[PDB]
Design an enzyme around this catalytic site. Structure first.
Site, PDB file in Angstrom:
ATOM      1  N   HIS A 161       3.582  -0.648  10.473  1.00 16.26           N
ATOM      2  CA  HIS A 161       3.534  -0.129   9.115  1.00 16.26           C
ATOM      3  C   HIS A 161       2.286   0.689   8.802  1.00 16.26           C
ATOM      4  CE1 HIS A 161       4.956   0.299   5.092  1.00 16.26           C
ATOM      5  NE2 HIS A 161       3.856  -0.225   4.581  1.00 16.26           N
ATOM      6  N   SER A 162       1.209   0.445   9.542  1.00 15.47           N
ATOM      7  CA  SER A 162      -0.036   1.181   9.349  1.00 15.47           C
ATOM      8  C   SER A 162       0.200   2.686   9.460  1.00 15.47           C
ATOM      9  CB  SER A 162      -1.077   0.763  10.400  1.00 15.47           C
ATOM     10  OG  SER A 162      -1.665  -0.494  10.100  1.00 15.47           O
ATOM     11  N   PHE A 167      -8.628   9.528  -4.822  1.00 17.80           N
ATOM     12  CA  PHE A 167      -7.594   8.530  -4.579  1.00 17.80           C
ATOM     13  C   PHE A 167      -8.146   7.144  -4.882  1.00 17.80           C
ATOM     14  CE2 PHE A 167      -4.936   5.770  -1.915  1.00 17.80           C
ATOM     15  CZ  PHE A 167      -3.679   6.228  -2.282  1.00 17.80           C
ATOM     16  N   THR A 209       6.180 -13.527   8.924  1.00 27.41           N
ATOM     17  CA  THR A 209       6.326 -14.608   9.899  1.00 27.41           C
ATOM     18  C   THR A 209       4.989 -15.025  10.524  1.00 27.41           C
ATOM     19  OG1 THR A 209       6.822 -13.039  11.675  1.00 27.41           O
ATOM     20  CG2 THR A 209       8.681 -13.986  10.462  1.00 27.41           C
ATOM     21  N   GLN A 237       0.369  -6.841  -4.945  1.00 33.75           N
ATOM     22  CA  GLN A 237       0.167  -5.575  -5.629  1.00 33.75           C
ATOM     23  C   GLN A 237       1.403  -4.697  -5.557  1.00 33.75           C
ATOM     24  OE1 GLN A 237      -2.790  -2.436  -4.386  1.00 33.75           O
ATOM     25  NE2 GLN A 237      -3.971  -3.391  -6.050  1.00 33.75           N
ATOM     26  N   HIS A 239       3.300  -0.780  -6.499  1.00 30.04           N
ATOM     27  CA  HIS A 239       3.023   0.645  -6.551  1.00 30.04           C
ATOM     28  C   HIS A 239       3.920   1.150  -7.677  1.00 30.04           C
ATOM     29  CE1 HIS A 239       1.793   4.499  -4.516  1.00 30.04           C
ATOM     30  NE2 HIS A 239       2.702   4.924  -5.374  1.00 30.04           N
ATOM     31  N   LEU A 262       7.949   5.929  -0.210  1.00 27.99           N
ATOM     32  CA  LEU A 262       6.834   6.405  -0.992  1.00 27.99           C
ATOM     33  C   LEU A 262       6.789   7.906  -1.225  1.00 27.99           C
ATOM     34  CD1 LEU A 262       5.026   4.571  -2.383  1.00 27.99           C
ATOM     35  CD2 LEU A 262       3.280   4.899  -0.621  1.00 27.99           C
ATOM     36  N   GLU A 281       3.751  11.747  -4.783  1.00 28.86           N
ATOM     37  CA  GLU A 281       3.720  12.716  -5.876  1.00 28.86           C
ATOM     38  C   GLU A 281       2.643  12.380  -6.900  1.00 28.86           C
ATOM     39  OE1 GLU A 281       7.717  13.604  -7.639  1.00 28.86           O
ATOM     40  OE2 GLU A 281       8.398  13.227  -5.590  1.00 28.86           O
ATOM     41  N   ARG A 288      -3.380   2.872 -11.840  1.00 28.11           N
ATOM     42  CA  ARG A 288      -2.037   2.589 -11.339  1.00 28.11           C
ATOM     43  C   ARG A 288      -1.577   1.212 -11.782  1.00 28.11           C
ATOM     44  NH1 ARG A 288      -0.938   5.162  -5.263  1.00 28.11           N
ATOM     45  NH2 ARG A 288      -0.899   7.348  -5.965  1.00 28.11           N
ATOM     46  N   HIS A 304       4.069  -3.577  -2.856  1.00 28.82           N
ATOM     47  CA  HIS A 304       3.406  -2.649  -1.969  1.00 28.82           C
ATOM     48  C   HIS A 304       2.397  -3.251  -0.993  1.00 28.82           C
ATOM     49  CE1 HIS A 304       2.041   1.198  -0.598  1.00 28.82           C
ATOM     50  NE2 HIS A 304       0.826   1.045  -1.095  1.00 28.82           N
ATOM     51  N   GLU A 328      -4.141  -7.061   6.624  1.00 27.49           N
ATOM     52  CA  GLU A 328      -3.360  -7.483   5.478  1.00 27.49           C
ATOM     53  C   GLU A 328      -2.845  -8.917   5.619  1.00 27.49           C
ATOM     54  OE1 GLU A 328      -0.231  -4.731   4.609  1.00 27.49           O
ATOM     55  OE2 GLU A 328       0.347  -5.719   2.746  1.00 27.49           O
ATOM     56  N   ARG A 339      -6.371  -4.999  -4.872  1.00 28.41           N
ATOM     57  CA  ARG A 339      -6.893  -4.152  -3.819  1.00 28.41           C
ATOM     58  C   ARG A 339      -7.175  -2.752  -4.371  1.00 28.41           C
ATOM     59  NH1 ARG A 339      -3.637   0.025  -0.771  1.00 28.41           N
ATOM     60  NH2 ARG A 339      -3.129   0.075  -3.009  1.00 28.41           N
ATOM     61  N   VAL A 387      -6.268   0.179   4.420  1.00 22.99           N
ATOM     62  CA  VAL A 387      -6.168   0.730   5.761  1.00 22.99           C
ATOM     63  C   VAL A 387      -7.606   0.699   6.292  1.00 22.99           C
ATOM     64  CG1 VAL A 387      -6.698   3.191   5.432  1.00 22.99           C
ATOM     65  CG2 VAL A 387      -4.962   2.491   7.070  1.00 22.99           C
TER      66      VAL A 387
HETATM   67  C1  FAD Z   1       3.558   0.076   3.203  1.00 24.40           C
HETATM   68  C2  FAD Z   1       2.455   1.069   2.957  1.00 24.40           C
HETATM   69  C3  FAD Z   1       1.139   0.607   2.982  1.00 24.40           C
HETATM   70  C4  FAD Z   1       0.053   1.493   2.752  1.00 24.40           C
HETATM   71  C5  FAD Z   1       0.278   2.882   2.494  1.00 24.40           C
HETATM   72  C6  FAD Z   1       1.637   3.361   2.472  1.00 24.40           C
HETATM   73  C7  FAD Z   1       2.709   2.489   2.694  1.00 24.40           C
HETATM   74  C8  FAD Z   1       4.128   2.994   2.671  1.00 24.40           C
HETATM   75  N1  FAD Z   1      -0.750   3.778   2.273  1.00 24.40           N
HETATM   76  C9  FAD Z   1      -2.023   3.321   2.300  1.00 24.40           C
HETATM   77  C10 FAD Z   1      -3.123   4.247   2.077  1.00 24.40           C
HETATM   78  O1  FAD Z   1      -2.960   5.430   1.886  1.00 24.40           O
HETATM   79  N2  FAD Z   1      -4.404   3.728   2.097  1.00 24.40           N
HETATM   80  C11 FAD Z   1      -4.640   2.337   2.331  1.00 24.40           C
HETATM   81  O2  FAD Z   1      -5.773   1.991   2.316  1.00 24.40           O
HETATM   82  N3  FAD Z   1      -3.642   1.471   2.556  1.00 24.40           N
HETATM   83  C12 FAD Z   1      -2.348   1.899   2.544  1.00 24.40           C
HETATM   84  N4  FAD Z   1      -1.319   1.042   2.780  1.00 24.40           N
HETATM   85  C13 FAD Z   1      -1.427  -0.400   3.113  1.00 24.40           C
HETATM   86  C14 FAD Z   1      -1.990  -0.367   4.589  1.00 24.40           C
HETATM   87  O3  FAD Z   1      -1.332   0.651   5.355  1.00 24.40           O
HETATM   88  C15 FAD Z   1      -1.864  -1.729   5.255  1.00 24.40           C
HETATM   89  O4  FAD Z   1      -2.475  -2.781   4.536  1.00 24.40           O
HETATM   90  C16 FAD Z   1      -2.426  -1.665   6.712  1.00 24.40           C
HETATM   91  O5  FAD Z   1      -1.901  -0.571   7.515  1.00 24.40           O
HETATM   92  C17 FAD Z   1      -2.137  -3.030   7.352  1.00 24.40           C
HETATM   93  O6  FAD Z   1      -2.584  -3.039   8.885  1.00 24.40           O
HETATM   94  P1  FAD Z   1      -2.313  -4.276   9.723  1.00 24.40           P
HETATM   95  O7  FAD Z   1      -3.026  -3.981  11.070  1.00 24.40           O
HETATM   96  O8  FAD Z   1      -2.791  -5.432   9.083  1.00 24.40           O
HETATM   97  O9  FAD Z   1      -0.834  -4.494   9.879  1.00 24.40           O
HETATM   98  P2  FAD Z   1       0.471  -3.608  10.251  1.00 24.40           P
HETATM   99  O10 FAD Z   1       0.141  -2.309  10.483  1.00 24.40           O
HETATM  100  O11 FAD Z   1       1.539  -3.930   9.268  1.00 24.40           O
HETATM  101  O12 FAD Z   1       1.014  -4.230  11.544  1.00 24.40           O
HETATM  102  C18 FAD Z   1       1.473  -5.614  11.666  1.00 24.40           C
HETATM  103  C19 FAD Z   1       1.802  -5.816  13.161  1.00 24.40           C
HETATM  104  O13 FAD Z   1       2.213  -7.211  13.321  1.00 24.40           O
HETATM  105  C20 FAD Z   1       3.348  -7.239  14.249  1.00 24.40           C
HETATM  106  N5  FAD Z   1       3.943  -8.540  13.939  1.00 24.40           N
HETATM  107  C21 FAD Z   1       4.290  -9.032  12.693  1.00 24.40           C
HETATM  108  N6  FAD Z   1       4.794 -10.259  12.750  1.00 24.40           N
HETATM  109  C22 FAD Z   1       4.780 -10.587  14.080  1.00 24.40           C
HETATM  110  C23 FAD Z   1       5.199 -11.808  14.804  1.00 24.40           C
HETATM  111  N7  FAD Z   1       5.695 -12.873  14.229  1.00 24.40           N
HETATM  112  N8  FAD Z   1       5.026 -11.756  16.173  1.00 24.40           N
HETATM  113  C24 FAD Z   1       4.510 -10.667  16.817  1.00 24.40           C
HETATM  114  N9  FAD Z   1       4.098  -9.518  16.236  1.00 24.40           N
HETATM  115  C25 FAD Z   1       4.251  -9.525  14.866  1.00 24.40           C
HETATM  116  C26 FAD Z   1       4.105  -6.020  13.903  1.00 24.40           C
HETATM  117  O14 FAD Z   1       5.009  -5.641  14.915  1.00 24.40           O
HETATM  118  C27 FAD Z   1       2.967  -4.993  13.780  1.00 24.40           C
HETATM  119  O15 FAD Z   1       2.650  -4.309  14.951  1.00 24.40           O
HETATM  120  O1  FUM Z   2       0.027   6.169  -3.113  1.00 25.17           O
HETATM  121  C1  FUM Z   2       0.039   6.188  -1.863  1.00 25.17           C
HETATM  122  O2  FUM Z   2       0.608   7.100  -1.178  1.00 25.17           O
HETATM  123  C2  FUM Z   2      -0.659   5.083  -1.040  1.00 25.17           C
HETATM  124  C3  FUM Z   2      -1.331   4.012  -1.639  1.00 25.17           C
HETATM  125  C4  FUM Z   2      -2.024   2.939  -0.822  1.00 25.17           C
HETATM  126  O3  FUM Z   2      -3.240   3.129  -0.498  1.00 25.17           O
HETATM  127  O4  FUM Z   2      -1.570   1.810  -0.809  1.00 25.17           O
HETATM  128 CA    CA Z   3      -3.924 -10.123   2.707  1.00 24.28          CA
END
Ligand code: FAD
Ligand code: FUM
Ligand code: CA
Ligand code: FAD
Ligand code: HEM
Ligand code: HEM
Ligand code: HEM
Ligand code: HEM
Ligand code: LMT
Ligand code: LMT
Ligand code: SF4
Ligand code: F3S
Ligand code: FES
Lengths: 239, 655, 254, 254, 55
Positions: free
Chosen positions: B43-44, B141, B235, B255, B257, B267, B270, B301, B369, B393, B404, B410
């Site tokens: 998701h990152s 931002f 999980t 939180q 959005h 997302l 805009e 927001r 979000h 996260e 947050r 990120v």
């Molecule tokens: C959803 C979202 C979040 C977001 C954003 C836009 C969207 C659509 N824009 C952001 C922005 O502009 N600026 C910012 O500061 N944050 C923004 N965010 C939130 C942010 O992207 C997230 O908080 C961040 O990327 C989280 O990183 P994290 O390294 O913690 O986690 P992840 O990328 O989600 O990856 C999770 C990994 O875990 C693996 N996984 C999950 N469960 C399991 C189990 N049970 N077993 C094994 N592996 C597991 C997933 O596969 C994944 O790789």
């Molecule tokens: O508004 C956005 O595109 C992203 C927000 C985020 O940092 O969570």
């Molecule tokens: Ca958290």
């Protein structure tokens, strides 16, 4: 919308001894803004929870949902049923990748191997101090590096390539593009000769037959045609 | 039995997990990264807003530093964060940006010249001097006065994730995808690894390590409407909870959005790049000025989401087959100049909403979000279960409290990956573990039996309708506005839902590559996570950050200046056990006050906050008189720890 | 063999421990021979269609073709040397380009299925390149050998004799479409392969090149299809069993 | 394409989940076409060398060759149909056997180096098979087309005309050794490949077959090298510019 | 550190080692056979006299 869609799906479980490759048809009612993502999840939750497929972002950004949709490698999450006049949609797993089951293939591990094969990382003699000011970079250069760095490793350009389908070791359009992405990055010190040692053979740039299907199918619209040619001209005059 | 060993086990292949793997692998510790999917699809990769870091490069970033970033973070958290952790964060963010730059992340750069607009009012022309040329740029931002959000055009999360994953490949980190951690192996309060299910073959395998780190992301998918990827189901949070020892922090702190596309949740950035997007109701009426005469659409927001819900409950929302929503109009623009990249959003609307933004309006509704809550750790990232760490996260390191800051998440993923990575490496190198096969076999055979019972279950419940019912309950009762009566009912239905999940039956009996089997064991886990959020929301009788109780509209700094700790001691209980960790006002650099957004004087003041505040004011004025610098004053107010590697100062333009 | 050759076969690398530059050189020569033959066939179509400008004109180019000043007489021996050269490049090109053919059942089945599912222009055009190239193994070889061993039989009536009398029209008819489709598509692909004209807007360039290809090829087939009729007509007119059409003799034969 | 064809491409298996039988059938037809052409060339050498038994005899076989009773006149149209058939098999064989060529730089360098280090007879003879087969792409196609379009030019003097006058001897000279080496080695390999005569002592059988091959081939080249001189002699004798050697006419042309 | 785990570790790929590996593997115990050389080249392969058994 209200229209009845005929969804034909390739099914096959290579891990099951009694499984045979065949097509299974489903009947789904079209809805506004309906995507293949929505179609497959409907089938999963209400018609056939057996079917395997891979979705993640459902926003066309992660490259997880690539598959053959009516003959073309495309991202299922950005594919609207609305764009199919016949109302008949055939789904096949992406070719040229190891099949797991039905529409699920191992795309990630092939790309990881590719990334290692072309050493997809910055090569620099010295390590810059992260507590100091960054090295300056012209905004134009940062922009062109970004353009090539937009690849989402969806695999559509690999599956689209007849060359790769016939010759497995071919590095593929995604691989050639990765090389150029580092070639034009000033942070990377490798020279043309270094890159030649990586893709300067028949499994590399010279194995490309310029079918151009990669360029015409890239959901990210990367400049593959000119970038690959650029690389070919460069590699052909190494030594 | 099948056993895999490594010195450092990382569960999760996102920015936090991969960055932590780099830290351990670079010091010779053999490390494995487990992930549900290829790591570059985490998701990152969807982050498009940017990353927050006080570089101070651009004109609008001029004068920015750790203190200013620290203040925005604390006030944003509405005083729910661990201020020391926030200090570790803001001080390290600048170096995370710079390290990524050295790793090739194509950050958008500054060029000499003037720019227009991108301002609320008054000024409208920005000038970037020649000495700023070529440095990492920043945009507006997160609503911070100082512009400090760095970005690589419109795909920041993507380029960042790719760079960190590539570094892992370079170092030879062992990346194993389509592998899922379904349980943690533990004994005598220590974590020795995880039981893993191979999603392809169905094999149950024990991964043992001297240290285990969970960086599994958020749990947004327990809600029906969310911006999160399909894999953010919590999980990782659950297996931690099911140890009966590790604790979850502020699970109720969710939180939302304000403007995701309805009903997909995709997302629409805009109104970000260039303010112009206008929110309209069912009558085409621009309503934001009615509630926020001054800030209008540009309000916090946090505020925009509330107003949108208020306006809908006022009966001015748009009806549709999927529920009610509002409109986002950006056609008011549909053109400009050039000199840089500015074209994306239209495609999102055309490819999914099936329409051109420059013409028709986009349907929107606030949606889940981000997950402030997560696995509770100390400042080092270690949980109560020794040897178990968490970052990103998935954790509640707690630099976010109850809200947050946009662009900070990120940033935390990478920063926590660096810091927790160091402590995690240290732990793995210095600790010595006793791996008993008796314990390994118990956990492994226990999960194999569990998988067998699911496949043999003659239950009649349908896993999918139970999961969908859960998501509705969460959306209807645990959203932007909450009240005791509805939370009471949701908690009751969730608990009932949890009991029915154990009577599920599935059609596909195979043990390998089985999507249906996956849901059968993941849903019960999601329900336990949901219960922690819901129950935590019910018991928290106050309004703080993103947590809004209509029946307790004020922030109570007397009885609730604390953190909710959830656990599940008895594997047979059906409701989480909640405890509270009080926040020591004396250990705060900034005493509780007005958060800076929302209604004024809406918090019950704590006598100690006033006491501590005066002390702070005094300690500062004095040391400042003696000509002491901000670094010495900060240390006198609230000293914090940082691993050796990152305790250096951050050089800025014009020191 | 040579020691360096043995070391490279067994180590997969050069004695200096570097990958061979041969694949690069082979890629270059494959394209170079293709380019030559491609342009050559363009001119060939003009001089061969001169018959449309009258028997006199065609007779002129023929005689003045390849060394005529050194000896006003004739010396068709030059056409033979010219044909020999072109034959050599034809063979070299076929040798090099042959490496690109699907080479087994799997590659064949697999590629054909892909082509039909894709319905992608440039991929289909490659199939045609391969197919037309294979056919020319037999078609082109015939014309090239005769042209190299009987250069004194080129002329308004002499050529028309072979065209109709000796029954060469079937081959020429098929070879016309074959080499034309092959050459034009090959010149086009050659442009995008090396990107000589990409410029700042490669997509517009490619679109233009594809349009040019269709126009150039449309013009060439129609012209060559008219030139076909030309020789065929003169051939059907030839009836006098006492006339030596083949070796018709002017000053220096014909 | 067909659904079964798609399922096989994508699954690598048959709809019944079995490996394709196509590779077996292709292997069969490759050998079958090779066998035919091999035997054919043997007879061809006899009838073509009849010129040694006198112009009269050669004239006899020619006329009585392919349908002569149905029409005592001639009807060389049969030789054309016969040539067409042989051409078809020639192409099919080339198509199938082509799959066995080294197809890239590595395979080529690597195999050549092995051949030179090994100094193993049967491995070297395969190289010759491949080499001679490639050359016949251009050499054989010429002879086959002419023989199919000008069957009325076959005869003691007519053939001798083309042999010398039209300069076909260079091609025939090279093609002689080419098809002979190719055909004899191919017939030999075909015997050990399928083991039709292995019996109880396969090693003695193979030794015998290799001895037979050398004898049969020695006999064929010498005979074909004599027949070569035959037509060449009669061709050098042809001088009268008023004699229509090519289409020499007896009762039904010549 | 690099660690490999198995239920039954057999050191030696001769007749004794391989036969013991069969016994353990046939009962679901994960087993690894370690050998200096490919197991089929072990000294056991040189036996030409025969095996004693009262048939
Ligand atoms: C959803 C979202 C979040 C977001 C954003 C836009 C969207 C659509 N824009 C952001 C922005 O502009 N600026 C910012 O500061 N944050 C923004 N965010 C939130 C942010 O992207 C997230 O908080 C961040 O990327 C989280 O990183 P994290 O390294 O913690 O986690 P992840 O990328 O989600 O990856 C999770 C990994 O875990 C693996 N996984 C999950 N469960 C399991 C189990 N049970 N077993 C094994 N592996 C597991 C997933 O596969 C994944 O790789
Ligand atoms: O508004 C956005 O595109 C992203 C927000 C985020 O940092 O969570
Ligand atoms: Ca958290
Ligand atoms: C030498 C000999 C012995 C022999 C015989 C003829 C010869 C030339 N003929 C025999 C006969 O006709 N009848 C008979 O009953 N015995 C005969 N023998 C003796 C007999 O063959 C041996 O006693 C028997 O084969 C021994 O079997 P065993 O399974 O014990 O051992 P092995 O075959 O020698 O294989 C030893 C394996 O150990 C591996 N190895 C050794 N050291 C290491 C270390 N440090 N680490 C890892 N692997 C190790 C070897 O690689 C090998 O695989
Ligand atoms: C003996 C018959 C021939 C064979 C076997 C043959 C085969 C091929 C094949 C298979 C290709 C594709 C190469 C690739 O994809 O890399 C090719 C390309 C090409 N051929 Fe031919 N060819 C023949 C004759 C000719 C002739 C007579 C011309 C002249 C019109 C010609 C011009 C070209 C051109 C322009 C290319 C592009 C080369 C490149 O892409 O580098 N070919 N040929
Ligand atoms: C070595 C140079 C060449 C010479 C001297 C030459 C000469 C000629 C001449 C004189 C004709 C007229 C009819 C006749 O004489 O029978 C002709 C026709 C033809 N040639 Fe060539 N040619 C050459 C190479 C080629 C090549 C390489 C190809 C293709 C592989 C080719 C394809 C054709 C075709 C298809 C025609 C038919 C023209 C039409 O009907 O429009 N030629 N050539
Ligand atoms: C167009 C020219 C030709 C080509 C491209 C060609 C090519 C080949 C090649 C490369 C092989 C080796 C096949 C293998 O190793 O499996 C082969 C085998 C053979 N060829 Fe040809 N060939 C040609 C013409 C002929 C002719 C005219 C004859 C008649 C003398 C002939 C008779 C044979 C025989 C007897 C075999 C053995 C087939 C087998 O082993 O199954 N070939 N040819
Ligand atoms: C379709 C059946 C064939 C017919 C009707 C036929 C007929 C003849 C005739 C009449 C000659 C005498 C000289 C002349 O007429 O120019 C001849 C010579 C020759 N043919 Fe054929 N041929 C056929 C197939 C082949 C094939 C398939 C090859 C080889 C690929 C071949 C190779 C030769 C050679 C090398 C000579 C020279 C004889 C010598 O000098 O000993 N022929 N052929
Ligand atoms: C278009 C030019 C082809 C380039 C030449 C090199 C590639 C092709 C030859 C090498 C691979 C051999 O390819 C193999 O040929 C046989 C033809 O007998 C095909 O056979 C199939 O197609 C042919 C032709 O439509 C049908 O008559 C036949 O019934 C069918 O089974 C095989 O499916 C193919 O896999
Ligand atoms: C004997 C018949 C060959 C069968 C045809 C199919 C296999 C061969 C062609 C496909 C592989 C291409 O093969 C490649 O050809 C070029 C020829 O320019 C060779 O080039 C090498 O040999 C040629 C010929 O002795 C030399 O003039 C040249 O200087 C030398 O570098 C490459 O080492 C070879 O690897
Ligand atoms: S280059 Fe384009 S099609 Fe190929 S992997 Fe990348 S984004 Fe996908
Ligand atoms: S389709 Fe394949 S052949 Fe080259 S042009 Fe693209 S990588
Ligand atoms: S699900 Fe991510 S691109 Fe389709």
């Amino acid at each position: 919308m209200g229209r009845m869609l005929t969804i034909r799906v390739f099914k096959y479980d290579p891990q099951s001894a009694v499984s045979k490759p065949h097509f299974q048809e489903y009947k789904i009612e079209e809805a506004p803004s309906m995507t293949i993502f929505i179609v497959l999840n409907m089938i999963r939750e209400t018609y056939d929870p057996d079917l395997n497929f891979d979705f993640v972002c459902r926003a066309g950004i992660c490259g997880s949902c690539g598959m053959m949709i009516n003959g073309r490698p495309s991202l299922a999450c950005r594919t609207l049923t609305k764009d199919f006049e016949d109302g008949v949609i055939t789904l096949l797993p992406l070719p040229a990748f190891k099949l797991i089951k039905d529409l699920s293939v191992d795309t990630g591990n092939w790309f990881n191997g590719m990334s290692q094969r072309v050493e997809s990382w910055i090569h620099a003699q010295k390590e810059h101090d992260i507590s100091k000011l960054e090295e300056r970079i012209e905004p134009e250069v940062a922009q062109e590096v970004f353009e090539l760095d937009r690849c989402i490793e969806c695999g559509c350009c690999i599956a689209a390539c007849g060359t790769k389908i016939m010759r497995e070791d071919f590095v593929g359009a995604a691989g050639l593009n990765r090389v150029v992405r580092f070639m034009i990055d000033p942070h990377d010190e490798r020279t043309d000769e270094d890159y030649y040692e990586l893709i300067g053979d028949d499994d590399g740039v010279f194995g490309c037959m310029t079918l151009l299907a990669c360029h015409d199918v890239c959901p990210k619209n990367l400049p593959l045609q000119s970038k690959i040619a650029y690389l070919r001209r460069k590699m052909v005059s190494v030594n | 039995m099948k056993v895999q060993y490594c010195d450092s086990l990382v569960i999760g292949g996102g920015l936090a997990g991969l960055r932590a793997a780099v830290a351990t692998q670079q010091k010779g510790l053999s490390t494995i990264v487990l992930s549900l999917i290829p790591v570059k699809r985490s998701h990152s990769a969807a982050a498009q807003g940017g990353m927050q870091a006080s570089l101070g490069n651009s004109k609008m970033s001029d004068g920015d530093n750790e203190d200013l970033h620290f203040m925005d973070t604390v006030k944003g958290s509405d005083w729910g964060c661990d201020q020391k952790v926030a200090r570790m964060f803001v001080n390290t963010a600048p170096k995370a940006i710079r390290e990524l730059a050295a790793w090739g992340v194509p950050w958008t750069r500054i060029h000499k010249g003037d720019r227009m607009a991108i301002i609320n009012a008054q000024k409208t022309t920005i000038t970037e001097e020649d000495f700023r040329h070529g440095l990492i740029h920043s945009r507006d931002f997160g609503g911070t006065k100082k512009w400090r959000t760095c970005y690589t055009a419109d795909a920041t999360g993507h380029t960042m994730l790719f760079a960190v994953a590539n570094e892992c490949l370079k170092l030879g980190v062992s990346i194993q995808d389509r592998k899922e951690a379904i349980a943690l192996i533990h004994q005598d309060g220590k974590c020795y690894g995880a039981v893993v299910r191979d999603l392809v073959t169905g094999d149950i395998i024990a991964y043992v390590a001297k240290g285990t780190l969970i960086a599994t992301g958020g749990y947004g998918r327990i809600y029906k409407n969310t911006t999160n990827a399909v894999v953010c189901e919590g999980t990782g949070t659950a297996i931690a909870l099911e140890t009966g020892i590790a604790q979850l922090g502020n699970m109720e702190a969710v939180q939302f959005h304000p403007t995701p596309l309805f009903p997909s949740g995709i997302l629409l950035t805009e109104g970000c790049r260039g303010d112009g997007g206008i929110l309209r109701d069912v009558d085409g009426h621009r309503f934001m000025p009615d509630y926020e005469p001054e800030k209008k659409e540009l309000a916090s927001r946090d505020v925009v989401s509330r107003r949108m819900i208020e306006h809908i409950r006022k009966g001015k929302g748009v009806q549709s087959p999927y529920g009610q929503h509002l409109w986002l109009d950006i056609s008011i623009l549909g053109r400009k100049h050039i000199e840089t990249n500015l074209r994306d959003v239209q495609e999102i609307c055309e490819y999914f909403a099936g329409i051109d933004p420059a013409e028709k309006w986009a349907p929107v509704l606030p949606m889940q979000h981000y997950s402030m809550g997560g696995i509770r750790t100390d400042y080092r990232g270690e949980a109560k279960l020794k040897g178990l760490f968490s970052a990103g996260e998935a954790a509640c390191w707690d630099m976010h409290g109850f809200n947050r800051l946009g662009g900070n998440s990120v940033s935390e993923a990478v920063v926590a990956g660096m810091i927790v990575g160091e402590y995690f490496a240290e732990h793995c190198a210095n600790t010595q573990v006793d791996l008993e096969t008796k314990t390994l076999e118990k956990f492994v055979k226990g999960q194999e039996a569990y998988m067998k019972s699911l496949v043999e279950s003659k239950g009649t419940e349908d896993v999918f309708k139970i999961k969908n019912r859960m998501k509705d309950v969460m959306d209807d009762n645990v959203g932007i506005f909450r009240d005791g009566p509805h939370l009471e009912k949701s908690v009751k239905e969730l608990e009932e839902l949890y009991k029915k999940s154990k009577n599920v039956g599935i059609k596909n009996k195979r043990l390998h590559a089985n999507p249906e089997l996956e849901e059968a064991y993941r849903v019960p886990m999601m329900l336990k996570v949901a219960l922690c959020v819901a129950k935590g929301a019910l018991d928290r009788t106050e309004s703080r950050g993103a947590h809004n109780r209509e029946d307790y509209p004020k922030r109570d700094d007397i009885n609730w200046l604390n953190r909710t700790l959830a656990s599940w001691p008895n594997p047979e209980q059906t409701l989480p056990t909640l405890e509270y960790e009080a926040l020591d006002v004396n250990e705060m650099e900034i005493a509780p006050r007005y958060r800076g957004y929302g209604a004024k004087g809406n918090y019950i003041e704590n006598p100690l906050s006033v006491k501590r505040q005066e002390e702070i004011d005094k300690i500062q004025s004095e040391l400042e008189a003696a000509g002491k610098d901000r670094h010495a004053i900060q240390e006198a107010l609230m000293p914090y720890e940082l691993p050796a590697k990152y305790k250096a100062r951050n050089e800025r333009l014009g020191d | 063999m040579t020691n360096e050759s043995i070391l490279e076969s067994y180590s997969g690398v050069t004695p200096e421990r570097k990958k061979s530059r041969m694949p690069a050189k082979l890629d270059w020569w494959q394209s170079a021979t293709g380019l030559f033959l491609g342009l050559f066939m363009i001119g060939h179509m003009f001089f061969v269609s001169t018959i449309l400008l009258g028997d006199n004109v065609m007779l002129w180019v023929t005689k003045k073709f390849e060394l005529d000043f050194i000896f006003e007489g004739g010396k068709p021996i030059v056409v033979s040397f010219l044909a020999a050269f072109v034959f050599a490049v034809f063979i070299a090109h076929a040798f090099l380009a042959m490496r690109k053919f699907p080479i087994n059942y799997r590659q064949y089945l697999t590629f054909k299925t892909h082509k039909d599912l894709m319905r992608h222009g440039d991929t289909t055009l490659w199939w045609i390149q391969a197919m037309t190239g294979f056919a020319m193994f037999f078609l082109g070889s015939v014309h090239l050998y005769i042209m190299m061993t009987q250069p004194q039989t080129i002329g308004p009536v002499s050529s028309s004799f072979r065209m109709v009398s000796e029954w060469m029209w079937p081959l020429y008819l098929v070879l016309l479409f074959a080499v034309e489709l092959h050459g034009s598509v090959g010149l086009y692909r050659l442009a995008v392969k090396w990107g000589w004209f990409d410029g700042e807007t490669p997509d517009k360039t490619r679109a233009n090149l594809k349009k040019l290809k269709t126009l150039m090829s449309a013009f060439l087939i129609v012209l060559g299809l008219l030139t076909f009729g030309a020789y065929v007509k003169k051939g059907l007119e030839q009836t006098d069993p006492n006339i030596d059409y083949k070796y018709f003799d002017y000053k220096r034969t014909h």
